[PDB]
Design an enzyme around this catalytic site. Structure first.
Site, PDB file in Angstrom:
ATOM      1  N   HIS A  44       0.804  -1.206   0.000  1.00  0.00           N
ATOM      2  CA  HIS A  44       0.000   0.000   0.000  1.00  0.00           C
ATOM      3  C   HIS A  44       0.833   1.249   0.000  1.00  0.00           C
ATOM      4  O   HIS A  44       0.318   2.323  -0.303  1.00  0.00           O
ATOM      5  CB  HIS A  44      -1.136   0.000   1.041  1.00  0.00           C
ATOM      6  CG  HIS A  44      -0.709  -0.012   2.489  1.00  0.00           C
ATOM      7  ND1 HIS A  44       0.265  -0.804   2.962  1.00  0.00           N
ATOM      8  CD2 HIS A  44      -1.253   0.640   3.596  1.00  0.00           C
ATOM      9  CE1 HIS A  44       0.384  -0.616   4.293  1.00  0.00           C
ATOM     10  NE2 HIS A  44      -0.545   0.260   4.675  1.00  0.00           N
ATOM     11  N   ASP A  93      -0.095  -7.525   1.688  1.00  0.00           N
ATOM     12  CA  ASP A  93       0.513  -6.215   1.818  1.00  0.00           C
ATOM     13  C   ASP A  93       2.030  -6.318   1.979  1.00  0.00           C
ATOM     14  O   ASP A  93       2.595  -6.039   3.040  1.00  0.00           O
ATOM     15  CB  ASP A  93      -0.109  -5.462   2.990  1.00  0.00           C
ATOM     16  CG  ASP A  93       0.205  -3.993   2.962  1.00  0.00           C
ATOM     17  OD1 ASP A  93       0.730  -3.513   1.915  1.00  0.00           O
ATOM     18  OD2 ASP A  93      -0.063  -3.320   3.989  1.00  0.00           O
ATOM     19  N   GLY A 186       2.250   6.672   8.709  1.00  0.00           N
ATOM     20  CA  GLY A 186       3.658   6.867   8.347  1.00  0.00           C
ATOM     21  C   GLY A 186       4.591   5.770   8.828  1.00  0.00           C
ATOM     22  O   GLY A 186       5.776   5.775   8.498  1.00  0.00           O
ATOM     23  N   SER A 188       3.768   2.522   8.240  1.00  0.00           N
ATOM     24  CA  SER A 188       3.608   1.470   7.224  1.00  0.00           C
ATOM     25  C   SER A 188       4.879   1.114   6.487  1.00  0.00           C
ATOM     26  O   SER A 188       5.681   1.984   6.138  1.00  0.00           O
ATOM     27  CB  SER A 188       2.581   1.865   6.180  1.00  0.00           C
ATOM     28  OG  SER A 188       1.347   1.292   6.516  1.00  0.00           O
ATOM     29  N   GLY A 189       5.029  -0.180   6.229  1.00  0.00           N
ATOM     30  CA  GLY A 189       6.191  -0.706   5.510  1.00  0.00           C
ATOM     31  C   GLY A 189       7.331  -1.056   6.442  1.00  0.00           C
ATOM     32  O   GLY A 189       8.228  -1.789   6.064  1.00  0.00           O
TER      33      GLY A 189
HETATM   34  O1  O61 Z   1       5.002  13.823   5.055  1.00  0.00           O
HETATM   35  C1  O61 Z   1       4.106  13.007   5.273  1.00  0.00           C
HETATM   36  C2  O61 Z   1       2.710  13.489   5.642  1.00  0.00           C
HETATM   37  S1  O61 Z   1       1.914  12.412   6.871  1.00  0.00           S
HETATM   38  C3  O61 Z   1       2.226  10.845   6.083  1.00  0.00           C
HETATM   39  C4  O61 Z   1       1.268   9.837   6.240  1.00  0.00           C
HETATM   40  C5  O61 Z   1       1.433   8.573   5.655  1.00  0.00           C
HETATM   41  C6  O61 Z   1       0.333   7.567   5.843  1.00  0.00           C
HETATM   42  O2  O61 Z   1      -0.855   7.919   5.853  1.00  0.00           O
HETATM   43  N1  O61 Z   1       0.719   6.264   5.958  1.00  0.00           N
HETATM   44  C7  O61 Z   1      -0.205   5.136   6.097  1.00  0.00           C
HETATM   45  C8  O61 Z   1      -0.064   4.195   4.884  1.00  0.00           C
HETATM   46  C9  O61 Z   1      -0.412   4.779   3.523  1.00  0.00           C
HETATM   47  C10 O61 Z   1       0.514   4.699   2.461  1.00  0.00           C
HETATM   48  C11 O61 Z   1       0.206   5.209   1.183  1.00  0.00           C
HETATM   49  C12 O61 Z   1      -1.034   5.803   0.944  1.00  0.00           C
HETATM   50  C13 O61 Z   1      -1.951   5.912   2.005  1.00  0.00           C
HETATM   51  C14 O61 Z   1      -1.658   5.400   3.282  1.00  0.00           C
HETATM   52  C15 O61 Z   1       0.177   4.351   7.362  1.00  0.00           C
HETATM   53  O3  O61 Z   1       1.297   4.395   7.880  1.00  0.00           O
HETATM   54  N2  O61 Z   1      -0.811   3.581   7.908  1.00  0.00           N
HETATM   55  C16 O61 Z   1      -0.490   2.833   9.106  1.00  0.00           C
HETATM   56  C17 O61 Z   1      -1.596   1.827   9.357  1.00  0.00           C
HETATM   57  C18 O61 Z   1      -1.689   1.310  10.772  1.00  0.00           C
HETATM   58  C19 O61 Z   1      -0.961   0.126  11.012  1.00  0.00           C
HETATM   59  C20 O61 Z   1      -0.980  -0.461  12.275  1.00  0.00           C
HETATM   60 CL1  O61 Z   1      -0.062  -1.902  12.574  1.00  0.00          CL
HETATM   61  C21 O61 Z   1      -1.738   0.126  13.294  1.00  0.00           C
HETATM   62  C22 O61 Z   1      -2.479   1.297  13.072  1.00  0.00           C
HETATM   63  C23 O61 Z   1      -2.462   1.911  11.808  1.00  0.00           C
HETATM   64  N3  O61 Z   1      -3.228   3.106  11.558  1.00  0.00           N
HETATM   65  C24 O61 Z   1      -2.794   4.370  11.210  1.00  0.00           C
HETATM   66  N4  O61 Z   1      -3.826   5.173  11.027  1.00  0.00           N
HETATM   67  N5  O61 Z   1      -4.935   4.410  11.239  1.00  0.00           N
HETATM   68  N6  O61 Z   1      -4.588   3.163  11.557  1.00  0.00           N
HETATM   69  C25 O61 Z   1       2.582   8.343   4.885  1.00  0.00           C
HETATM   70  C26 O61 Z   1       3.563   9.340   4.722  1.00  0.00           C
HETATM   71  C27 O61 Z   1       3.394  10.611   5.326  1.00  0.00           C
HETATM   72  N7  O61 Z   1       4.362  11.647   5.188  1.00  0.00           N
END
Ligand code: O61
Length: 236
Positions: A44, A93, A186, A188-189
């Site tokens: 993702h 994923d 942020g 993720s990955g």
């Molecule tokens: O400069 C910036 C502005 S803020 C920012 C946000 C994200 C982001 O939304 N990441 C998402 C993933 C994503 C990637 C690409 C497109 C869209 C979304 C994420 O980490 N998602 C992490 C998911 C997650 C995992 C676990 Cl194990 C637990 C709770 C969460 N939750 C986070 N929010 N709700 N749940 C990525 C880069 C960023 N850099």
């Protein structure tokens, strides 16, 4: 990372920060060095990425503020996304980045080992999530790599909390019953790293969760041991 604590230089030497440069440069996702030319991360992460040209992988980073315009990075030659990936919540994923060159390993850039052949039944009790994501649902990318220790919850328990998703054997769950610590936006990955017999293993990849650090709502991770054949197939 919610409820986490700052890391020190050298501490998680397999943690990378993956930057997009389109339309401007920013942290997109975390990732783990698993080979001299190979990063493991989440599919993702590439939802809006037009091609690998716009990607930079930075290693040996503690603070995001260390990344100046003369800071060295690794170009990405390829993004190998699992052919069955559609969206995080529905599994698969996982993604490999084939770097344009070989990371020479140093104190600050080291490989994390995959879960080992014969350890299918190890119980991992020392697992950590790392990354520069949010500390709360509405926050900002953090400057200093955060870390939090998080306990694995069984897939049976994880399904009871997420009765509107299909939690499979290819997912692994991790979180406290009362919340407080978790991955967030942020992160993720990035890795859910676990230490067994003093060796670190890449057990999980940060994928999805309902909110961040909510009680009875565990983080859900790609279960890397179930993708080892896939990883080897693609990295050979
Ligand atoms: O400069 C910036 C502005 S803020 C920012 C946000 C994200 C982001 O939304 N990441 C998402 C993933 C994503 C990637 C690409 C497109 C869209 C979304 C994420 O980490 N998602 C992490 C998911 C997650 C995992 C676990 Cl194990 C637990 C709770 C969460 N939750 C986070 N929010 N709700 N749940 C990525 C880069 C960023 N850099």
């Amino acid at each position: 990372i919610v409820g986490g604590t700052a890391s020190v230089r050298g501490e998680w030497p397999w943690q990378v920060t993956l930057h997009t440069t389109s339309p401007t440069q920013r942290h997109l996702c975390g990732g783990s060095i698993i080979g001299n030319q190979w990063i493991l991360t989440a599919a993702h992460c590439f939802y809006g990425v037009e091609s690998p040209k716009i990607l930079r992988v930075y290693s040996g980073i503690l603070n995001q503020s260390e990344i100046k315009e003369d800071t060295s990075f690794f170009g990405v030659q390829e993004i190998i996304i699992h052919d069955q990936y559609k969206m995080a919540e529905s599994g698969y994923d996982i993604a490999l980045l084939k770097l344009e060159t070989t990371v020479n390993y140093t104190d600050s850039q080291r490989p994390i080992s995959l879960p080992s052949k014969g350890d299918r039944n190890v119980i991992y009790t020392d697992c950590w999530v790392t990354g520069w994501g949010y500390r709360k649902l509405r926050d900002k990318i953090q400057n200093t790599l955060q870390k939090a220790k998080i306990p694995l919850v069984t897939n049976e328990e994880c399904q009871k909390r997420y009765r509107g998703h299909k939690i499979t054997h290819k997912m692994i769950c991790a979180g406290y019953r009362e919340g407080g610590k978790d991955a967030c936006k942020g992160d993720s990955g990035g890795p859910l790293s676990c230490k067994h017999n003093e060796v670190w293993h890449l057990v999980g990849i940060t994928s999805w969760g309902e909110g961040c650090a909510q009680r009875e709502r565990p983080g859900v991770y790609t279960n890397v041991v179930e993708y080892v054949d896939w990883i080897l197939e693609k990295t050979q």
